[PDB]
Amino acid sequence: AGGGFFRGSSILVSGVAGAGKSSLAAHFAAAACARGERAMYFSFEEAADQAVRNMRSLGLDLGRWRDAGLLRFMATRPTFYSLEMHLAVILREVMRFEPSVVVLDPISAFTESGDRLEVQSMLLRIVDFLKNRGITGIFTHLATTDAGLSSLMDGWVLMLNREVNGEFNRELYLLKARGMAHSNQVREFLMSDRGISLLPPHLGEGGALTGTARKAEEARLRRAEIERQTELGRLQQQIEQRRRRARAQIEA
Amino acid sequence: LDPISAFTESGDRLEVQSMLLRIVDFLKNRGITGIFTHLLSSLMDGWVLMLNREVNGEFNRELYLLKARGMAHSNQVREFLMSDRGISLLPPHLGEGGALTGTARKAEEARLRRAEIERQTELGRLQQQIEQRRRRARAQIEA
């Protein structure tokens, strides 16, 4: 309700591997750069040129914004520093760059690097700095049990690559968006050359399905409607012929 | 690297993951393809899951591809059979049942074939009954 997340917000694109979390975060950042604004990507497991090449498959051209200076791609590894040094470098770059949108992908990388209490401290400090400076933050996360990091974030988008009958169908949930009204429905996020496209659910018996299951239910309903109409015609013809029989008996 | 699980099973998590990240970085910097066989998965640009599952008292061999950053990889789980001629991958039977991809695939083939034969025999029996009832009606009319 209202057209998207609040500007001053902490978003959590969580998922399993292969769920397009980095892709959705890249879309956020490219939108920031398209509105005339200025944005940062903080990749902790991928290269900048690799990212440009890979997202050009989904249709984004992050290279234009990078060249324009509206996109800064900072690639650093979780183990090449101390988590405190990571915090310091990130804060310094963000300060000099004065962004509007900041992506951290994946924040799961800063886990084994340090004690978990210190991990929560680092993440909370980052979140607080971004919010307090009024910067939209996107935080990608990798995994179904308990994470605990969702409370610090104000928006939760859950991406899922689910195996259904030997096929990995892609689903997107908007689990939480504090201070707003949002759909409690499972949209189907299709990755394609044009981009990421969320398709609406199939409302009816059995749920949304959202995939080859949707096609199966649609085909079942189709065949069943044809069966019903054929039965209706059969019974109408039986009635008509029995009526002919009785009228002829009356004539006899 | 067959297998990288050897390092992990024993070493400290941070240390072993640091070594792994370093190896990957060096290989990519020198422009070298890197296969890593494993018995954690986001540091890789492609991920192939191999499975030897149990189905009705018989183990079956299924391969599929659940990651590939800059490409479009099929979301289907194909059946991989190993043999002297080589390693082969057979597509799944689409439609009812999903994929099965095993001796249960052979069983579904057999069941659908049996049901088609049954449909044909029963439509034939109905045709024969209809013809016989038509002959009965003709005879009664002549009477």
């Binding site: 039965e231 059969r234 013809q237 012929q241 029989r245 002829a248 | 439509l123 109905l126 009606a137």
Partner: peptide
């Protein structure tokens, strides 16, 4: 008689369809 025969034919087709169901 002929019309009853036709109706019986239709009923048999309907039974085949129901079995399909």
């Amino acid at each position: 008689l002929e019309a009853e025969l036709q109706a019986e034919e239709i009923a048999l087709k309907a039974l085949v369809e129901s079995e399909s169901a």
